[PDB]
Amino acid sequence: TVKADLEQKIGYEPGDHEVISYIMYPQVFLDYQKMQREFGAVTLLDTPTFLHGMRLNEKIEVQIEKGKTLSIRLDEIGEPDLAGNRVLFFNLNGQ
Amino acid sequence: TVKADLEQKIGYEPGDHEVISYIMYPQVFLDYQKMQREFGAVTLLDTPTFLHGMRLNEKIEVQIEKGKTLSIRLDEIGEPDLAGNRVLFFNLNGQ
Amino acid sequence: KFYFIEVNPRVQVEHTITELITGVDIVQAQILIAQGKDLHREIGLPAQSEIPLLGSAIQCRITTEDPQNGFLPDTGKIDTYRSPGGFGIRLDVGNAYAGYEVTPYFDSLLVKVCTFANEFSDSVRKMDRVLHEFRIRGVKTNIPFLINVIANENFTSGQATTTFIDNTPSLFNFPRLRDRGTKTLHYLSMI
Amino acid sequence: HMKKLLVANRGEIAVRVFRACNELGLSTVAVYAREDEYSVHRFKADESYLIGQGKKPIDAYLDIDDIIRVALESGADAIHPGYGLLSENLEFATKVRAAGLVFVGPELHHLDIFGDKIKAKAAADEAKVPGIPGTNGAVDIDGALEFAKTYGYPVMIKAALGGGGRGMRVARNDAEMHDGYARAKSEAIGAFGSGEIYVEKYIENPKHIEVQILGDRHGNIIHLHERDCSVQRRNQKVIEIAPAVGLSPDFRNEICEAAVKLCKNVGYVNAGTVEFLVKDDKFYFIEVNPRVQVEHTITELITGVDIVQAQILIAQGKDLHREIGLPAQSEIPLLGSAIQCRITTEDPQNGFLPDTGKIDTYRSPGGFGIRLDVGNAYAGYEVTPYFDSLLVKVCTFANEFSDSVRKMDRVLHEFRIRGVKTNIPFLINVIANENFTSGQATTTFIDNTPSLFNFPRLRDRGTKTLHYLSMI
Numbered sequence: 001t002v003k004a005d006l007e008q009k010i011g012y013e014p015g016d017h018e019v020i021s022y023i024m025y026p027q028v029f030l031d032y033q034k035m036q037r038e039f040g041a042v043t044l045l046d047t048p049t050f051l052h053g054m055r056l057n058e059k060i061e062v063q064i065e066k067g068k069t070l071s072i073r074l075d076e077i078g079e080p081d082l083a084g085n086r087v088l089f090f091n092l093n094g095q
Numbered sequence: 096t097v098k099a100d101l102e103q104k105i106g107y108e109p110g111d112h113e114v115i116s117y118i119m120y121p122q123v124f125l126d127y128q129k130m131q132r133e134f135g136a137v138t139l140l141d142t143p144t145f146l147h148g149m150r151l152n153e154k155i156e157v158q159i160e161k162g163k164t165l166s167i168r169l170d171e172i173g174e175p176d177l178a179g180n181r182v183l184f185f186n187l188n189g190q
Numbered sequence: 191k192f193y194f195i196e197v198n199p200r201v202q203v204e205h206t207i208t209e210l211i212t213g214v215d216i217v218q219a220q221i222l223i224a225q226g227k228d229l230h231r232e233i234g235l236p237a238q239s240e241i242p243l244l245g246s247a248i249q250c251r252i253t254t255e256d257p258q259n260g261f262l263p264d265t266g267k268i269d270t271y272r273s274p275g276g277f278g279i280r281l282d283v284g285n286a287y288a289g290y291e292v293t294p295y296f297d298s299l300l301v302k303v304c305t306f307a308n309e310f311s312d313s314v315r316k317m318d319r320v321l322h323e324f325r326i327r328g329v330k331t332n333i334p335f336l337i338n339v340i341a342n343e344n345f346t347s348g349q350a351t352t353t354f355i356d357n358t359p360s361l362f363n364f365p366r367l368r369d370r371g372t373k374t375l376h377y378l379s380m381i
Numbered sequence: 382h383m384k385k386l387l388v389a390n391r392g393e394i395a396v397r398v399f400r401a402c403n404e405l406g407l408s409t410v411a412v413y414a415r416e417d418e419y420s421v422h423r424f425k426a427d428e429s430y431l432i433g434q435g436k437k438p439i440d441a442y443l444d445i446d447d448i449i450r451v452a453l454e455s456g457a458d459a460i461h462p463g464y465g466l467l468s469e470n471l472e473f474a475t476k477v478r479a480a481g482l483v484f485v486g487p488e489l490h491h492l493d494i495f496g497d498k499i500k501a502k503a504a505a506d507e508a509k510v511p512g513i514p515g516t517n518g519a520v521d522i523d524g525a526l527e528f529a530k531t532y533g534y535p536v537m538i539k540a541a542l543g544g545g546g547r548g549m550r551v552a553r554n555d556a557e558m559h560d561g562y563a564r565a566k567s568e569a570i571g572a573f574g575s576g577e578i579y580v581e582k583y584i585e586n587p588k589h590i591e592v593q594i595l596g597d598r599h600g601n602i603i604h605l606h607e608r609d610c611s612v613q614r615r616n617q618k619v620i621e622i623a624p625a626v627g628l629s630p631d632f633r634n635e636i637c638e639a640a641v642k643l644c645k646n647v648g649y650v651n652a653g654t655v656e657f658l659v660k661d662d663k664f665y666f667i668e669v670n671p672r673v674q675v676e677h678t679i680t681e682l683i684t685g686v687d688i689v690q691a692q693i694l695i696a697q698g699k700d701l702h703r704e705i706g707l708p709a710q711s712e713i714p715l716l717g718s719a720i721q722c723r724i725t726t727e728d729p730q731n732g733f734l735p736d737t738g739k740i741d742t743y744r745s746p747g748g749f750g751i752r753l754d755v756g757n758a759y760a761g762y763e764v765t766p767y768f769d770s771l772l773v774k775v776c777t778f779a780n781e782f783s784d785s786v787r788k789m790d791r792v793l794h795e796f797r798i799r800g801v802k803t804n805i806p807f808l809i810n811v812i813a814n815e816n817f818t819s820g821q822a823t824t825t826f827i828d829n830t831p832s833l834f835n836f837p838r839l840r841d842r843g844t845k846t847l848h849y850l851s852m853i
C-alpha cells in the first residue's frame with residue numbers, strides 16, 4: 001500500500017529501500033525527492049562547491065557519471081532586477 | 096599627387112571633398128578616418144547615446160540605413176579582469 | 191479509393207520533403223513562375239516522366255507544445271539551443287536561438303527539421319538521431335512525442351492513418367529525462 | 382558483436398562518426414586533450430575521456446598507448462580514427478588490431494602499400510593503372526639531376542611520406558633541384574625522419590580528380606563516383622566539387638573503372654580514395670588515401686550513400702550489397718552535383734595565416750540543398766593555434782551545377798563569423814569566378830588569377846557600434 005502511494009507521489013516505481021525510507025521518514029523523504037527533482041544529484045559536487053557555491057571566474061568540473069564531466073565556469077553575476085531575479089552567466093560545456 | 100597619397104592612407108579612392116578636406120586638416124582628417132574604421136558612423140547615434148553610452152537594461156534603436164535598424168540592449172556589464180578589460184553583455188538584434 | 195477533400199492555393203509547410211525527394215526548389219520555381227517564366231524553358235525542370243524520386247524524406251515540426259500538458263504551447267526563454275547536422279539532414283529554423291523569448295502571440299513552431307535518405311528505414315534512424323541530438327532547454331517541446339511516434343512500428347511500416355495517434359496510448363508514455371546540467375546550474379546559482 | 386565505438390580524432394569528423402554510430406545504434410566514446418576541453422565533439426558522445434595529459438595537444442591525439450588504454454577501459458569494441466592524426470598510422474592499426482579492437486579502416490597491407498608513394502606507384506603499375514612517369518623508388522640528388530636531364534623539364538620534387546606542402550617543391554630551371562632536395566629532405570626529417578624522395582614529371586595545368594572507393598571483406602569493390610578537387614591554393618585544396626562537371630561522363634567512368642581495378646588488384650577493404658592528375662583525356666595515378674577524406678560529403682550527397690555508416694558496417698564485416706543495401710555499380714545514381722567549401726580561420730588579407738581569438742558571433746544558414754558539418758565554431762568559442770584552422774565545412778547540392786554555385790554563394794553571404802578572420806571573402810571570389818562556374822578549373826587556376834585576392838570593404842556596422850557604445 002505504501003509502495004503504491006509512494007509511486008503515486010514520487011512519480012516512479014520505488015525500491016524496497018525507498019519504501020522503507022518513506023516509512024521511517026515520511027516528510028523528510030518527500031522533501032529529499034523534491035530536492036532531487038529540483039537540484040539533481042548534488043552529492044557529486046565537492047564540499048567547498050556544495051557549501052559555498054561558485055566564485056567569479058572560477059572553473060569547476062563535476063563528474064555526473066563515468067565518462068561524463070560537466071565543465072562549469074561562472075563568468076558574471078548580474079544585478080538583481082525589480083522582480084528580485086539575478087542572471088548568472090554560466091559557461092556549461094563550453095557554451 | 097595628394098589624391099594618390101590620400102588613397103594609400105585611407106585605403107580607398109577619395110572623393111573631391113575628401114581630398115580638399117585632407118589639404119586643410121591633414122591630421123584631423125586622418126584621425127577622423129581612423130575613427131571611422133574603429134567606431135564607424137557614430138553620427139547616426141542619438142545624442143544622449145553619443146555622449147553617455149548606454150545604461151544597464153537600456154534598449155536603444157540605431158537606424159544605420161534605410162530599412163536597417165539595429166536593436167541594441169545592454170544586459171550586463173562585467174567586472175574588469177587582471178588585464179583591465181570589461182566584458183559587456185549586449186543583445187544585438189535579439190542575439 | 192482516393193477522394194478529393196481540399197486544395198490549398200499556397201506553398202505549404204511540407205514542401206521541403208517534396209524538394210528533397212524531387213530535387214526541385216519549390217520556392218525558387220514559385221518566384222520564377224511569378225516572373226512569368228516557363229517551367230521547362232527557363233526554369234529547367236524536366237518533363238513529367240523524367241522527374242526523379244530521390245529516396246524518401248521525413249519532416250518533423252518541433253514546436254513548443256508540451257505533450258505532458260495536453261499539447262499546450264509553452265512560453266518562456268530558450269537558454270540552450272543545439273542543432274544537429276550532417277548527411278541527410280535539412281534544417282529550416284524559425285525563432286529558436288539561445289536567448290530567444292518565446293511569446294504566446296505567434297505559432298508554437300520552433301524549428302522544422304527534414305531528414306532524407308534513399309531508404310525509408312535510414313530516414314527513420316536519422317530522424318531519431320536528430321531528435322535525440324536536438325537540445326532545446328528552458329521551454330517545453332514535443333520532442334519526446336516525436337520520438338515516440340518515430341519508434342512506432344506503424345510509422346516505420348508506413349501504414350499510419352489519421353486515427354493512428356489517437357488509437358495508440360503508448361505514444362503518450364514519456365521516459366524521465368535526468369537534465370543534470372540544468373539542475374546543477376540551478377543549484378550552483380542558488381548557493 | 383560491435384556495440385561501442387571510440388573515435389581517435391577530434392572536431393567535425395568525430396561528430397560525423399558519432400552521428401553515424403548513433404544512427405547505427407552504437408554507443409560512442411570521445412577522447413580529448415586538455416586544450417580541447419571546449420570542443421563540441423567531447424560533449425557529443427556518451428563517454429569522454431582526457432588523453433595525453435601533460436603533452437602538447439597534437440601529441441595527445443597521436444598518443445597511441447593512451448587512446449588504446451582509454452578504449453580498453455571504456456569497453457569500446459572498435460576504434461575509428463577519422464582523417465589525419467593516426468588515420469594512416471600503421472603502428473596505431475597494429476596496436477588496435479593486436480589489442481582485440483576492430484579498426485575502422487583498410488587492412489595493414491593496404492596501410493604500408495599506401496603509406497608511401499613509392500610502393501603505391503609500384504602497386505599502381507603492377508595493377509596496369511597508367512601512372513605518372515618519374516624516377517623509380519629512392520633516388521638521390523644525382524638521380525634527381527639524371528631524371529631532370531634525360532626526361533627534360535619541368536620536374537616536381539615530392540617526398541614519399543606526407544605531402545600537402547610538406548616536402549613538395551618544384552623545379553623549372555637548373556640549380557633549383559639541389560636546394561629543393563635539401564628543403565624537402567629537411568621537412569621530411571622534421572616530421573618522419575629520413576624519407577626518400579621521388580622526382581615526378583611535372584604537368585602544366587593539371588586537373589585533380591579523386592575517386593572514392595568502397596570495398597568490403599567479401600571482395601565486393603564499388604566506386605561511389607569521382608570528385609574534382611582541382612581548385613587549389615599552394616597545392617592545398619580549398620573548394621571541392623562532385624562530380625567533375627568539366628569532364629565528359631565516359632572519361633569519368635573510365636577513371637572510376639581504373640581506380641576500381643587498382644583497388645580490386647590490391648584487395649582493398651573499407652573506404653579509400655584514389656587521387657589522379659588529369660590532362661587532355663589522359664589520367665595519371667598519384668596516391669591512394671587509405672581513409673575517408675574531408676570531402677567525402679559531396680560524394681555522399683551526389684550518390685546518396687552514407688560513407689561513414691558503410692565503413693562502420695564494413696568494419697563489422699558485412700556484405701556491401703546484401704547487408705548494407707548498396708546497389709550494383711551501374712545502379713549507383715548521380716543525384717545532381719555538390720560543392721564543398723571549408724570555412725577556416727585563414728585570413729586571406731594576411732597571407733592565409735590562421736587567425737586565433739574568441740568568436741563572438743556565429744550564424745549558420747539552412748534550407749534546401751544545404752549540408753553543414755560544423756567543427757568548433759559556436760559563439761563564445763576561443764580559437765586556439767594548436768589545432769587545424771577549420772571552423773565548419775558546408776556543402777551545397779542541387780540538380781544543376783549552376784544552382785549549386787548560387788546556393789553556395791547564398792550560403793557564404795549568409796554566413797557570419799565575427800571575432801576571427803575567415804577565408805569567406807576568398808571563397809566568395811573563387812565562387813564568383815567564371816572558370817570555376819564553367820568547371821574547367823585547374824590546379825594552377827588560383828595562382829594564375831590575381832583577381833581572386835581583391836576583397837570588397839566590409840562595413841561591419843554592428844561590431845563598430847557595439848565597440849563605440851562599450852567605449853563610451
Ligand SMILES: CC(=O)SCCNC(=O)CCNC(=O)[C@H](O)C(C)(C)COP(=O)(O)OP(=O)(O)OC[C@H]1O[C@@H](n2cnc3c(N)ncnc32)[C@H](O)[C@@H]1OP(=O)(O)O
Nearest residue numbers: 068069322323367368369370371399400403425426427429
Ligand atoms: C552526435 C550524436 O549523435 S548526439 C545524439 C544524442 N546525444 C548523445 O548520445 C551523447 C550526448 N548525450 C546527452 O546529451 C544526454 O545524456 C542524452 C541525449 C542521452 C539525454 O540525457 P538528458 O536526460 O536529456 O540530460 P543529461 O542528464 O544527460 O545532462 C547531462 C549534461 O552533460 C552533457 N553531456 C552529454 N554527454 C557528455 C559528455 N560525454 N561529456 C560531458 N558532458 C556531456 C549533456 O549535453 C548534458 O548537458 P545539457 O543540459 O546541455 O543537455
Ligand SMILES: Nc1ncnc2c1ncn2[C@@H]1O[C@H](COP(=O)(O)OP(=O)(O)O)[C@@H](O)[C@H]1O
Nearest residue numbers: 537543544545581582583584589616667668824
Ligand atoms: N607532377 C605533378 N604535376 C602537377 N601537379 C602535381 C604533381 N605532383 C603533385 N602535384 C600536385 O600536388 C598536390 C598534392 O598531391 P598529393 O601528394 O597526392 O597530396 P598530399 O600532398 O596531400 O599527399 C596535388 O593536388 C597535385 O595537383
Ligand SMILES: [Mg+2]
Nearest residue numbers: 195196197198
Ligand atoms: Mg487540409
Ligand SMILES: [Mg+2]
Nearest residue numbers: 544656668670
Ligand atoms: Mg594527396
